[PDB]
Subunit: 124 residues, 5 copies
Amino acid sequence: PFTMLHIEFITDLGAKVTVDVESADKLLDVQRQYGRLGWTSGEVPVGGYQFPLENEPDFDWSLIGARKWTNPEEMILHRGHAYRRRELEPAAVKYSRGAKTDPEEYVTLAIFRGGKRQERYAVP
Amino acid sequence: FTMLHIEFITDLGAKVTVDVESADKLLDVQRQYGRLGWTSGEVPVGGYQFPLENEPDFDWSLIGARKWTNEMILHRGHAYRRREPAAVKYSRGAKNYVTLAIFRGGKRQERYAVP
Amino acid sequence: PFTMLHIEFITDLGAKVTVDVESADKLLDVQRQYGRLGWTSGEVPVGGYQFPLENEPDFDWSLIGARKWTNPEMILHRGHAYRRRELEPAAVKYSRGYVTLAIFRGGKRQERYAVPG
Amino acid sequence: GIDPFTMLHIEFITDLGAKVTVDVESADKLLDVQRQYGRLGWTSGEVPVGGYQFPLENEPDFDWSLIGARKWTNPEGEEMILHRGHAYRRRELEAAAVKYSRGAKNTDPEEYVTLAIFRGGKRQERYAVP
Amino acid sequence: PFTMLHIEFITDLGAKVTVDVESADKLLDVQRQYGRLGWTSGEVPVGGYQFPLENEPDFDWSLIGARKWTILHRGHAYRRRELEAVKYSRGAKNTDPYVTLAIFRGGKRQERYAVPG
């Protein structure tokens, strides 16, 4: 009746678009839907997002407006940027790129370490 | 008709605004999404300032925090330790000391407590 | 029909809350209402607010989320305390340890700024 | 291409520095709302670096309430433009332009700062006083 | 009682105006409409927008509030340059923290980015 949510995006054209959501349990569906187009919401936290380690092999990258993509090398595309996969030995997996256009030798998109697995982060 | 609206940053960093029916329900909605790790607004320079008598039973979900023993306070993938007019401080020290909350002075406020 | 206004506050808990208003002539009522709770809207302008001189003795401090408070007479605004100062045009200022909250000088009196009565 | 049935919303900063957003029925009523609250001294958005840019043929009868300003003659006898507790003086520029600006101070990070420049362009009637 | 979209613009008078949109498939029409008036949405990404290379000869500049002028964007003028990719950039300025607008390079050509018809 008035139990509505609103999510604010930045689009592929850089436009500032807010999308209405019917209720709380439909929020993630909306996030994947517009993330599939390359739209993002909010800023990347300093040092990149932090996710559980057991969520790495099947993480839905559309939750943050990213997609997998292969070169003449398997990469992750996020805002006309490409991130490479790294292994750290607790175990961890980082996704980074070279700095510089350099708002303060590497800047990370996401780090997978520790924590307990969360199902909602996985590809349905 | 007329409502209220509160703006959050979620666990996925998303910018989500939540509708509220009326003023007497703002805190209920704050505790609710605070329990999920959602925050609203910025931490004031020098940390929040609460009355001294509100320390032993402060509802940390009001600011998106949770107690966690390894006894620490988790607020955004950050951990704060307890430290001791008298006063109590919750702090750390990184590179991006920085305090989350200070309890000192003031008269008590029952709305700040765990229901 | 299409006559709503929306005012954005920062609460006592630092939360970011926007309040709906029925129409323009009910805006000040909403400002005093949430102002008494300590909620503020917007930023304090550099050099403090500027009000007419004849509005000093009876200014509604709730219009900016402030309140009178005497310790063993101050103005409380966000866990900060401002002291009263005089100057001799004749101007009254509220200062603390210098950063100012409000300066009262010149101008013609404005009725809506006074405590209702 | 204007849609008759979709609402708009405009965000102001008031005389008390409060953040207030105003609802508008449709696109064709936006200007009416801008003049109304502009006459009270409310502003929307920031002054673009180097000041606003308007067509030259709009200077003699520009509605200053469109940006929350007003004309004001002062004790010394000079005609000024008031915008947010600031006063701007009228200057002319011969090759042709017209400039409204004031001296810069300490509490102002970039010596002059300008409010509006009238130069070139073709006339637009919506900028004029009704 | 339905679910819409909302797009936030900065106008020709610098005002902050948000426009309602009926549904997702009508967003583009709204963008072209107010873009034709010089309204923009969001900020120009550092290093400028990035498009597919095959979208250059018939790009609808109204999608970002620009217009052809034998490119005008925000009272600024940008010149065409070739790379051997196509670059649109202007000189420096004493009022900005070469600065490029759009860069066409690689990628697969996209439907909607073209002037309709």
